[PDB]
Write a protein that binds this DNA or RNA. Structure first.
Ligand SMILES: [Cl-]
Ligand SMILES: [Zn+2]
Ligand SMILES: [Zn+2]
Ligand SMILES: [Zn+2]
Length: 120
DNA sequence: TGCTTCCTGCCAATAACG
DNA sequence: CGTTATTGGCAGGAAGCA
């Protein structure tokens, strides 16, 4: 159908037929495969752009609304995504957000309707 | 070479099923 | 509506880009 399997050292991999990318998760292969098939379409609700993954569309739509969900706990500045937040904390505070301390807060998404993670 | 978007393991939230 | 399947949000490194 849309994949074959490699089994190496007991570990199972799922291989896309088209580009031969390997996936540990079958769910990942399927998510990825839409890029080839365009079976599903994820159109920005604010403009003409269309995405092959739902999450790509959501991250894009956040740019339309201007919501700043990522907040630096050291100085309070907020950022639209992880990358700007991380870049700020490393350059300005000389600390790594992926270290063993919580240096930022991810606020819930309020400018769009997306599913809510209870831990935020 | 510093923004910008992509990528995929993981799994909570949601949907589908029966 | 309780059990199973699916969706897609998240991190944070990778890749794209000018
Ligand atoms: Cl905001
Ligand atoms: Zn592929
Ligand atoms: Zn748009
Ligand atoms: Zn700060």
């Amino acid at each position: 159908d849309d994949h074959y399997e490699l089994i190496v050292d007991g570990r199972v991999y799922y291989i896309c037929i088209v580009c031969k990318r390997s996936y540990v998760c079958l769910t990942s292969l399927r998510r990825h495969f839409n890029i080839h098939s365009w079976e599903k379409k994820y159109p920005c609700r604010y403009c003409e752009k269309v995405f092959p993954l739902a999450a790509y569309r959501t991250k894009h739509e956040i740019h339309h609304t201007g919501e700043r969900r990522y907040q630096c706990l050291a100085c309070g500045k907020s950022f639209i995504n992880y990358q700007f937040m991380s870049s700020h904390i490393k350059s300005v505070h000389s600390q790594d957000p992926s270290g063993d301390s919580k240096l930022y807060r991810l606020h819930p998404c309020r400018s769009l309707q997306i599913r809510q993670y209870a831990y935020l």
